[PDB]
Amino acid sequence: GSDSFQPEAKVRCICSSTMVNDSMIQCEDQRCQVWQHLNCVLIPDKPGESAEVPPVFYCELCRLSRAD
Ligand SMILES: [Zn+2]
Ligand SMILES: [Zn+2]
Known part of the structure; x- marks a missing residue:
């Protein structure tokens, strides 16, 4: 806010x-x-399906810094 x-x-x-x-x-x-x-950070294999929720989540900052 x-x-x-x-x-x-x-x-x-x-x-x-x-x-x-x-x-x-x-x-x-x-x-x-x-x-x-x-x-928002979930990308399901299909629309309305079971999204992929991994154990470790890294924001954009970490994502880029990791280049994963
Ligand atoms: Zn959101
Ligand atoms: Zn982060």
Whole structure:
């Protein structure tokens, strides 16, 4: 919203919404600590199917820095 960005709990999703979506998830990087909407970062093999929810989730920052 304005100053609701905690150093350990910071919701940064592509939707720019720090609300309580279907399911939230925190980055697996202690140097990031960024929460994101699982549904937003979920890529199901099909539309309306079982999305792929991996054990370790890395935001865009970590994703690029990792080049995975
Ligand atoms: Zn989102
Ligand atoms: Zn991250």
